[PDB]
Amino acid sequence: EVILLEKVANLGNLGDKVNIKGGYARNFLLPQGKATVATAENVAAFEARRAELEKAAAEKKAAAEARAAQLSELVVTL
RNA sequence: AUCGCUGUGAAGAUGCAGUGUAUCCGCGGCUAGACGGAAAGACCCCGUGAACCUUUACUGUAGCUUUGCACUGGACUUUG
Incomplete structure (x- = not known):
């Protein structure tokens, strides 16, 4: 009933x-920009933007390549 | 035009019967009667009357409480 993102x-x-x-659907996915209710009004707009799904979803796992290298340093002085 | 007694009588009589007493009218007192006056008896009964209190009367209800279904999601584990 929802398209994931x-x-x-x-x-x-x-x-x-x-x-x-x-x-x-109501309380988590839709207010956080990660899903949208599958309606029958703009379905021909989704198929003319399918090459938009590749770039940010490839870049997200590509940004965590050098993001996790600064969290396990254990240099935090309590 | 409002006596006494004895009877009689819705059964305790000024008014009935019989019979005694008694000239007409106040005033001051006293309360024995007028089943005196005051209140459509309070007790008792009755009303297929009422009211309000009680409870283990009947029937319900506020409140309290149990679970189901909504609001209400993901993730693992035990399990039919």
Whole structure:
């Protein structure tokens, strides 16, 4: 009932329509820009933007290549 | 035009019967009667009357409480 927009969910995919609970669509996914309710009004707009899904979702895992190298330094003085 | 007694009588009589007493009218007192006056008896009964209190009367309800379904999600584990 929703199109996903992130591939790091524990039971999610790239852009697959999944039918989920109403609270999970309502309260978490839609206010955080990671899913949108699968409506039958703009479906021909999704197929003319399928090459937009590759760039940011490849760059996200590519930015964590050098992001995790500064978290495990253990230089925080309590 | 309002006596006493004895009877009689819705059964305790100024008014009925019989019979005694008694000229007409105040004033001051006293309360024995007028089943005196005051209150459509309070007790008792009755009303398929009422009111309010009680409870283990009947029937319900406020409140308190149990679970289901919503609001209400993901993730693991035990499990049919």
